[PDB]
Point group: C3
Chain length 145, copies 3
């Protein structure tokens, strides 16, 4: 009806106001349909995954250059490396998203992936490039929604 | 129409992104259809009620074990007791929600309600159990929306 | 349909919960259909405009007494003056919103606008009244959404 068109407009406006506020305050970065955010904590991979799922999201993983740059800006902001949502396959060198699917977009630092002790996790340097490492380090927790 | 199904999906996604961000940042706890949040202030009952209504919510009151535990986690988090949304009836011993209705779910500390000077308000200990007290103490303000 | 009426209700509830949380935490002030918010930064006019647009909003401009008072409360809160969304016309004395339209609601401090060196920008004193000044000062950035 006509009353429906009105309600949707207000609802859309309100969402746009709340997201604008969170953005202005630096609580989140929006890229396309994805929203990235961090709780400022620096913990290991398992802990990050838990924190994000508990917040109703998932450990962040860039799938485009723009997404990768948004996460990179957060890592730079906190002067810390970020663990990404991906892990090495059974056969070293290959990586897959946490759902199993194989990674498509990649931004490895030159020479990487270079598995010392079978580097299973992936960290993002502050310049945005990736390094495959182990998963017990303390890294900035960044989630995507 | 079909364009309507699309709009609703995006709107639902966005809300889920903003709530995810607030959750990740510890600004609010969601339990079922209820959201709890605190402004970190420790003031008396009247002041808490005003703050919550002014924010478009109400002084929190647990109606299920899960809700009670969520509030308890916030009280523990701030290492302070929380005033709950309920007050003693005209006849001591009985308590009612702020709308008048009688309390159903209760989690009194053993021995409570124990009205010294006609304990009218109800505070939540950090372990989640309740104690009926007076209303002039300074307690953590927790609201529900 | 009937399932639509239900979805809208939940969506409206959720938005009301997120806005309630932001309000309680002092992250934003709602006035009618307008939301004001600040990132706590004190920068010049050009910088403020950029910050707000980047957040999906615009440098704040009061169009009613109530809106003016809400912004005034924020300026008082941070003990700093706020640059408003308006600039002086080609012919001194006249001011227009950033879209070109001429200002309607005004709250000039007695004697203002008083253009010393052709005061082009407008700042809000902590009492809510306005003073036309230059645009290079460092003022609290307040956006509207
Ligand atoms: Ca490596
Ligand atoms: Ca007692
Ligand atoms: Ca002047």
């Amino acid at each position: 009806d006509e009353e429906l068109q009105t309600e949707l407009y207000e609802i859309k406006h309100q969402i746009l106001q709340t997201m604008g506020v969170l953005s202005l305050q630096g609580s989140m970065l929006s890229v396309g349909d994805k929203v990235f955010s961090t709780n400022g904590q620096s913990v290991n991979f398992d802990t990050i995954k838990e924190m994000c799922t508990r917040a109703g999201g998932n450990i962040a993983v860039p799938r485009t250059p723009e997404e990768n740059e948004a996460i990179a800006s957060i890592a730079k902001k906190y002067n810390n490396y970020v663990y990404l949502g991906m892990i090495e396959d059974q056969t070293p060198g290959d990586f897959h998203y946490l759902d199993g699917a194989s990674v498509s977009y990649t931004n490895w630092y030159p020479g990487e992936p270079r598995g010392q002790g079978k580097e299973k996790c992936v960290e993002m340097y502050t310049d945005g490039t990736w390094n495959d490492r182990g998963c017990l380090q303390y890294r900035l927790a960044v989630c995507e929604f």
